[PDB]
A paper describes a structure:
Here we investigated the hepatitis B core protein (HBc) that forms the viral capsids and plays a vital role in the HBV life cycle. We explored two distinct binding pockets on the HBV capsid: the central hydrophobic pocket of HBc-dimers and the pocket at the tips of capsid spikes.
With a K_D_ value of 4.9 +/− 0.7 µM, the SLLGRM-dimer (**4**) has the lowest affinity to HBc, followed by the P2-dimer (**5**) (K_D_ =1.9 +/− 0.4 µM). To further substantiate and quantify a possible dimer-induced HBc aggregation we next performed a turbidity assay. We found that P1 dimer induces turbidity of a HBc solution already at 1:10 equivalents of HBc, whereas the P2 dimer was slightly less potent and the SLLGRM dimer did not induce turbidity at the same conditions and further required significantly higher concentrations ratio relative to HBc ([Fig figs2]). The analysis recapitulated our earlier resolved sequence requirement for HBc binding and substantiated that the minimal sequence SLLGRM is the major mediator of HBc binding. The densities corresponding to bound peptide-dimers in both EM-reconstructions have volumes which can accommodate a peptide chain of approximately 6 amino-acid residues ([Fig fig5] and [Fig figs10]). Comparing the relative occupancies in samples incubated with (**4**) and (**7**) suggests a lower occupancy with (**4**) than with (**7**). Interestingly, the SLLGRM-dimer binds the A/B-dimer as well as the C/D-dimer, in contrast to the monomeric SLLGRM which binds only to the tip of the C/D-dimer,([Fig fig5]) in line with the multivalent binding and the higher affinity we measured with ITC.
Author numbering:
A (entry chain A), C (entry chain B), D (entry chain C), E (entry chain D): 1 to 143
B (entry chain M), F (entry chain E): 405 to 409
Write the structure that this text describes.
């Protein structure tokens, strides 16, 4: 079964393929802001929003992946091998979950409208050749 | 425990 | 943060901790069930229910875990430790994801009222010693 | 042309594959049933039902495939490859037509709703562990 | 059981035997026409017509026959009798399926009344000896 | 995978 995790919210993997991989913030930073801004509601006994529902599962799945890879690298005695493992993780699953957390945190904070318009505007900015590319990249802001 | 690749 | 994936739906990890591992079907079986029954809606561009949301996320997370496990088993060339790590994977995370898929599918099918009453009654039955409980367990079914 | 023979009726190949393959009766038995119960309605000059139309066409397609296979078996001499082609037939086309005849006969006899709910119920049943399901397999009956 | 695929629609294998065998278009051309004109209705979840039901089933049966013959030809090592196999397949089943596709597409496009009258009038034209039959045969058309 | 006639 092919499921797009954003088709439910108004986006697609091809719409977030606009943003590059290097664009998304660290999982550390994303979880930090998730806590600081929505901890009381993520720990709540309520459907507060589908974004809350999805973000909870994303956080728990990141935890499970971390436990897996940690236990694995620990069972792995060789540093080159464990470093290879965590590199692959960070590249593939790290990037998936950075996309996901960024999307949900950003949408909770700003709005579906703002986040999708931001996706298209950033696509414009990154498609523009450098000689005409403003150095001020698009930024989300409640200000 | 193990190691490879 | 410490998130309970069921507190938002009206349950806990201690209400589903009583159900033994023998109770839950395989992940393959549960995914086949989810597909056959709710794929139209899971692939839909709608919030149909928090259960649909959570189930989408759970399926995607299990897929990521499987990709990691396959890549690891392939790169590593030792079958003994390979089976050991996949045994860890199953024993730990397959149980969690079986609980999760079962809970969401069963809630969608029957009702939260029904599933929580069933969990209460099954816990009464499983805390009871065999000498003093009926031989056959409680049953949640569509006949 | 991506046509699903059941989409016009309210089912899918995925749902009918939700039951195991060793559950569907033989083509001989199902054709005997179709004759006994609906011969005068299938040999009729009337659109008695879409199920009737589909059953007619499926019976005829099975006849064509049988003629072809018999001619091929006359041509080919080696029992090895002869049993091989019989195996391929009864594995792919045999199963397709078993599922199709079963679906149409059963719907004609019981109801589309009844047959689809039965598909779902029997799949959940065959996937549930035994200690926590009704011990007797679901049976589709008129009495 | 003896089923006539046209008795349900108001015709018979005798009426469609007024048209010769070399009259009917290629199966590829008839399928192209079917796609072109009724793809979205044949791929639909609706009983749009008994003609649609029949056409779906017939397309599927043709696919199954072709699948069988292809698996055969590719799994065999003798490419000599692969000429007689297609000779038989065409001569026998291709004619049936051409007759069938033609009847259904024509009775969808033009109508039952028109197609029956066409069959009768073309039987007249072709029963007539060549020294007394016009060159402008009956043609099935909207203009 | 062998043929005759």
């Amino acid at each position: 079964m092919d499921i797009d995790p954003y088709k439910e919210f108004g986006a697609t993997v091809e719409l977030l393929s606009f943003l590059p991989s290097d664009f998304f913030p660290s999982v550390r930073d994303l979880l930090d802001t998730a806590s600081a801004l929505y901890r009381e509601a993520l720990e709540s006994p309520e459907h507060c929003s589908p974004h809350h529902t999805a973000l909870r599962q994303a956080i728990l799945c990141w935890g499970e992946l971390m436990t897996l890879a940690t236990w694995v690298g620990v069972n792995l005695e060789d540093p080159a091998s464990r470093d290879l493992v965590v590199s692959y993780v960070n590249t593939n699953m790290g990037l998936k979950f950075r996309q996901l957390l960024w999307f949900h945190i950003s949408c909770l904070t700003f709005g579906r409208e703002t986040v999708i318009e931001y996706l298209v505007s950033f696509g414009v900015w990154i498609r523009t050749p450098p000689a005409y590319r403003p150095p001020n990249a698009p930024i989300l802001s409640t200000l | 425990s193990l190691l490879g690749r």
